[PDB]
Amino acid sequence: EDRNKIHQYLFLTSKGYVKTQFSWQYYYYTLTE
Amino acid sequence: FSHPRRYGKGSRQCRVCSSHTGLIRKYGLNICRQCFREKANDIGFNKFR
């Protein structure tokens, strides 16, 4: 549940489904198809 | 694990490169002394005199 909470907050950093942009310290995350 | 850092050089960091040195604490920029002079056009700071 400790990861289910964030994975349902969404709608892991390396497996996929994640684009990481830094842009002054704010770790811009987005999902992929 | 963390002692209080609400003031001093370590309290605030540069919003651009996380540098604790050369920070300009003026007008609410919080941008380092090189980063601001680099990205001065995007804030509107320009040279005329």
């Binding site: - | 300009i24 003026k26 007008y27 002394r33 090189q34 601001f36 002079r37 001065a40 804030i43 509107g44 700071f45 320009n46 040279k47 005329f48 005199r49």
Partner: protein, 100 residues
């Protein structure tokens, strides 16, 4: 009628004056009463800094300034003639706040 005071602040003089004159004219053909636009002194936000990203070379400093300026106009109008002129000024770069 309700009394309002609009304040216009911006960095770009051309569009700031376009707004400051558009509001005056569009009150004019609608026949309102207003005291002329008061021109508060321009604030130069001079920021001194070091040209060198380090401490080598002759001591040379770099001075920036972001000239910001501002005008205010007070008048009276009903709510329709306030909102229909408040929604005219959408020019990017000039911010206007209306106090009642």
């Amino acid at each position: 009628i309700i009394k309002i005071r609009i304040t216009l602040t911006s960095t770009k003089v051309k569009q700031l004056e376009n707004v400051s004159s558009n509001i005056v004219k569009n009150a004019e053909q609608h026949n309102l009463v207003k005291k002329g636009p008061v021109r508060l002194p321009t604030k130069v936000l001079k920021i001194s800094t070091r040209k060198t990203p380090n401490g080598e070379g002759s001591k040379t400093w770099e001075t920036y300034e972001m000239r910001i300026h501002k005008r205010y106009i007070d008048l009276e109008a009903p709510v329709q003639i306030v909102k229909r002129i408040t929604q005219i000024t959408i020019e990017p770069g000039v911010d206007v706040e209306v106090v009642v």
